[PDB]
Amino acid sequence: VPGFLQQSQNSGPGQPAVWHRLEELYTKKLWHQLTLQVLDFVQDPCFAQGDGLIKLYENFISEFEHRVNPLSLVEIILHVVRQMTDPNVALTFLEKTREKVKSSDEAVILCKTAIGALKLNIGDLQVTKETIEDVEEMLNNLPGVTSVHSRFYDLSSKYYQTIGNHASYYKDALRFLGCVDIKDLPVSEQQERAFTLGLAGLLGEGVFNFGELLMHPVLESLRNTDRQWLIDTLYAFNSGNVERFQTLKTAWGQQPDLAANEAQLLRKIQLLCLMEMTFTRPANHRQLTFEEIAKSAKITVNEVELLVMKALSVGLVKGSIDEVDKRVHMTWVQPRVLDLQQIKGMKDRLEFWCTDVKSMEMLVEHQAHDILT
Amino acid sequence: PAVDTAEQVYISSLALLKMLKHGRAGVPMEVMGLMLGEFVDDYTVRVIDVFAMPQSGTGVSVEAVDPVFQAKMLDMLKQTGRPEMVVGWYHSHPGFGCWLSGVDINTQQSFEALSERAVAVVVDPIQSVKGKVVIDAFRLINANMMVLGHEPRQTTSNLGHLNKPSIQALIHGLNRHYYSITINYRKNEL
Amino acid sequence: MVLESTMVCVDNSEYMRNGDFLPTRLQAQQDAVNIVCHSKTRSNPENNVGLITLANDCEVLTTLTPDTGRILSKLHTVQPKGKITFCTGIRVAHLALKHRQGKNHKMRIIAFVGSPVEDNEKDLVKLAKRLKKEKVNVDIINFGEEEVNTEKLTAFVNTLNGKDGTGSHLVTVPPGPSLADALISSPILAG
Amino acid sequence: IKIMKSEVLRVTHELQAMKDKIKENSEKIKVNKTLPY
Amino acid sequence: LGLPTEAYISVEEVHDDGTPTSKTFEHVTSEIGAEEAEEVGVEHLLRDIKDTTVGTLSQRITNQV
Ligand SMILES: [Zn+2]
C-alpha cells in the first residue's frame, strides 16, 4: 500500500504535500483527521485525473475502515462519481457503496439523492418518482441534520424540468433555501436560485401568496443590479398594481417561459389586482363598483364579473355578485403579508377596539354595581 | 393520658381527592393505602398526603401492607422532598358505610403497634354521591380501659359536636371498639 | 473503605472514531470505566457510581447507583457522533453529585477527555475555584489525540486544590498500545 | 476478547434483571390469585 | 382570569416558507375536566363559595362582566 501511494504520489500540487500529508495520519491508525484531510484534498481544485488511482486506495481504506464516518464516505463518493463520469457503471458503483454500508446510519439517503441526480439525465420519468417518494418517506425521525434535506430538495429542484412542476418546485425551493442559510455558494448560484424561484412563482398555478418576496432573505438581498426587475415584478404581484410596463420589461428578457404565458400572467395580475383593490377597502364599504374594477385592471366591464367569479371559485374570495346594481359584495377568508406601517395602523385600530371594550366594561360594572354581587 | 374528643384529622385537599379517586378506581374491590403526614400535637392529625399501594388478593389486611413498596416509596418521596411519617391508613368500603370490621381491627392494632396515634380512615366510594362525601376516621379503644370504669376519651371541650353517627356504625359496633374522630378538611386558598 | 460517590464522565464524540487506541477508543474507554468503577466498588461496597456522557449533550443515563451493572449497561451502544462540551459536563457532574443519597460519602469525579477542550482559561479557572469553594475532588485523564499536558488542564488541577492539598491528578496516557495500568498505579491507589 | 466478555456480560445482566422481573411479576400474580374461585 | 394549564407539543418541520429550523413548542388547547369521584370531592371541598348552577340574573350579569 505505501508503494502504491508512492508510485501514484503524482497528480497533485506539491506531490508529497497532497498524499503523504494524509498518509501521516494514516500510519498512526487514524481515520478522523485523515477523512477530513482527504475530503479537503478532493475539494482541492484539480481535474482529478488521479481518480482512477484513488478508488483502489478508497477501496483499500474501505476494506478495513470500521471507524470512518458514513456521511464523509458518501460525501466523498458523490464527488468520486461526479469525477468518473461513466453513468452506465456509476449506478452499480453507487449501489455497491450503498450496500456496503447498510447500518442504521443515515447516509443511504444521500446515496438515493445521488442516484436520483445521475438518474434525472437518463430515464428520468418512470421510476424516478419512486426514488423521490422513498427518499421523502425515509426522511423522518431526524430533521436536525439539514444536509439530507438539502440533498432531497436539490433533487426536487432538479425535477423542476418537467411539464407539471411549477408551484411544487417553488415550495421545494423554499424548503431548500430554508434548510441552507449562509451563503456557502457563489453569488451567481444564489441569484440563479432566486431567479428560478421567481419564475416558479409567476408561473405557479397553485401559488399566489408571494409572502416571501420581502420575507425571504435570499431574493430580497440578491439581484440589485443583475436583472433586478424580477423583485420589482414580484413587488407588483404583491402590490396588485397594473405595472404591465414591468411585465414587458421582463418580456424583452426571459422570452421563453414568459412570452408564451403572458396571457396567464395577465390573468394572475388581474386576480391579484382584485385582491389588492378590495384589501385597500376601508372594511366598512366593502362593496366594489364595476367602474373601479374596469379602470384598475384595465379590463372591460363585462369581464369583471367573470374575473371575480374565478377568484371566488379558486378559494380566495367568499363574497357575492349583484347585477341590477352590479356591486360585488365582499367577504374575506384569504389573508396576506403585512408591513411596518400597516402593522402600526392596525395596532392603532386594535387599541381603539380595546379602548371601546374597556369603556363599555366600565359602564356595565358601574351601572350594575348592586346587582353584580 | 386519654385522648380527647376535640382531636380531629386535617385532610389536605389532594389527600382527599387521591383517596376518593382510588376508592372509585378499585370498586367493587376494597383498596387501601398509607396516610403520610405529621401528628404535630396531641389534638391534631395532619394528613398531608396519601399514596396508593398495589392491590393484593388478601384484600384490606396486614399481609397486603408489603413493606418493600412502602419503604421504597417512603424513602424516595423523601428524596423528592416529602419526608412525612405514616399517621394511619385509608381503605374503601363500597356500599358498606364508614365502619371497621374485624380485619380492619387487626390492621389497626398492627398500625398502633409502631405508631400509637394511628388513624384508620374509611371511605365509601359509591356512597360518596355528588354533594355527599361519606368519610370517617377511627381509632381503637382496648377493652381494658373502657371495661375498667374509664371513659374511652375525655371530652375536655364542646368539640363533640359530631352529630349522631350513622346507625350502620352502631350495628357494626362503633363505640364498642373504635372511637370515631371528628373530621376537618384543611383547604388552602391557592 | 472510604465512603465516596463516583461520578464518571465518559466521551462519545466523533474524535473517538479513529483507531488510535486498541480496536477503537470506544472499547478502550469502556474497559477504563469498567476497571476504575471495579476498583472503587470493591474498595468499598457501600459506595455508588454513575455516568454522564459529554457529546453535544450531558445525559444522566445512570444516576448514582451502587450497582455498577447499570453503568455498564448504558456504556454500551454509545454511538460516537457528538461533540465534547467540557464546560457544562463538569458542571452537570457536580449538579448530579449534589443529589447524593448518602450524606457521608466523599466527592470524586472522573471525566474522560478524549477530545480537545474548547474552553476559556478564565472559565476553567473559575470552575476550579468554585470546586475549591464547594470541596469537590476531580481527576482528569486524557486519551487519544490531544495537546499533550494541556496548560489549561494543568492549571485547572493545580488550582483545583492548592497549598498542600490531596493532589487531584492530571493523568495523561501514552499514545499507542497502552492500557490503564498507568491509570491505576498512581491515580487509583491514591488520590 | 472484546466480543466475548462484552456481550457475555451484556446478555447475562439483561437476562438476570429480566428473570428477576419475571419472578416478581409471577409472585404478584400468584398472591393476586388467592381463593376462592 | 382562567385556564391555569397550557399544553405544548414539540414539532419539527422545515417551516414551509423557507426559514431556519429550530425546535419550537407548538401549542395544543387544554381544558379542565373531572372524574365523578374527583367531581364530588371538589364540590364538597369548596362547599362555601360554589355559585348556584341555575345562574339567575346576578350571576349571569357577572358572567357577562
Ligand atoms: Zn375494612
PDB file of C-alpha atoms in Angstrom, chain A residues 28-33 66-71 142, chain C residues 14-20 22-24 26 80 145:
ATOM      1  CA  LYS A  28      -0.964   6.422  13.046  1.00  0.00           C
ATOM      2  CA  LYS A  29      -4.098   4.244  12.725  1.00  0.00           C
ATOM      3  CA  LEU A  30      -6.236   7.375  12.425  1.00  0.00           C
ATOM      4  CA  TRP A  31      -9.455   7.881  10.464  1.00  0.00           C
ATOM      5  CA  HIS A  32     -10.956  11.240  11.557  1.00  0.00           C
ATOM      6  CA  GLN A  33      -8.293  13.823  10.752  1.00  0.00           C
ATOM      7  CA  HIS A  66     -14.693   0.093  10.566  1.00  0.00           C
ATOM      8  CA  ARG A  67     -14.431   3.638  12.001  1.00  0.00           C
ATOM      9  CA  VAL A  68     -14.875   6.218   9.207  1.00  0.00           C
ATOM     10  CA  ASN A  69     -17.942   8.460   9.279  1.00  0.00           C
ATOM     11  CA  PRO A  70     -20.505   7.211   6.719  1.00  0.00           C
ATOM     12  CA  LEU A  71     -21.535  10.805   5.991  1.00  0.00           C
ATOM     13  CA  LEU A 142     -34.129  13.210  12.358  1.00  0.00           C
TER      14      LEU A 142
ATOM     15  CA  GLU C  14     -16.628  11.806  16.781  1.00  0.00           C
ATOM     16  CA  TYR C  15     -12.961  12.131  17.792  1.00  0.00           C
ATOM     17  CA  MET C  16     -13.366   8.655  19.342  1.00  0.00           C
ATOM     18  CA  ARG C  17     -13.857   7.317  15.787  1.00  0.00           C
ATOM     19  CA  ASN C  18     -10.190   6.717  14.908  1.00  0.00           C
ATOM     20  CA  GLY C  19      -8.268   3.627  15.957  1.00  0.00           C
ATOM     21  CA  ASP C  20      -5.623   5.458  17.969  1.00  0.00           C
ATOM     22  CA  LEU C  22      -6.994  -0.595  20.630  1.00  0.00           C
ATOM     23  CA  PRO C  23      -9.663  -1.522  18.018  1.00  0.00           C
ATOM     24  CA  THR C  24     -11.069   1.926  18.804  1.00  0.00           C
ATOM     25  CA  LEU C  26     -14.802   3.347  22.464  1.00  0.00           C
ATOM     26  CA  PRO C  80     -19.995   8.260  18.853  1.00  0.00           C
ATOM     27  CA  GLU C 145      -5.312  12.990  20.008  1.00  0.00           C
TER      28      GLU C 145
END
